[PDB]
Design a protein around this ligand. Sequence first.
Ligand SMILES: CS(=O)(=O)NC(=O)[C@H]1CN(c2ncnc3[nH]c4cc(F)ccc4c23)CCO1
Length: 167
Amino acid sequence: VNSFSGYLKLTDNVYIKNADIVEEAKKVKPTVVVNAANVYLKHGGGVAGALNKATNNAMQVESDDYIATNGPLKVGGSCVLSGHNLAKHCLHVVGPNVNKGEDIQLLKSAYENFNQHEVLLAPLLSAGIFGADPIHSLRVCVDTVRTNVYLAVFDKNLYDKLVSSFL
Ligand SMILES: CS(=O)(=O)NC(=O)[C@H]1CN(c2ncnc3[nH]c4cc(F)ccc4c23)CCO1
């Protein structure tokens, strides 16, 4: 039993809700919140900008030190950093950004990072400003993640579409 509330169950291990991931994180304080990161950990907009704003820019300060030490992430890769006031940990995962021409096949590699964590609160990778089809992203999630994932979808119209079209 965990504290996630109001989710629709899609599969044995995948759950979905129309929610603001920032508000969901502040209420649940999950062990892991996933950020929709880029390779530079520049949290300017989308999910990343919202998560970082909610940390009063502490996420960005920590991220800048990470990059200065380690260099950029790989597309499809991840790193574990602090969850600040939102979660114990933040798993920064880089999905491909279609608006940069990145290979959508890397989306599966991106979701594989979730399997290193037993339970996660996450957005749909490569959705939103990353330019991928969220219905495809949900399919890859379901077919790749084996650990327990709670997906927060900000847009109510999109949430209803994802549910209605789910196979
Ligand atoms: C690869 S992405 O990060 O750019 N994907 C997207 O942006 C998708 C999904 N986004 C979110 N999903 C869940 N919770 C969210 N809180 C937010 C707060 C914001 F100020 C902006 C977006 C979100 C958001 C919504 C917009 O479209």
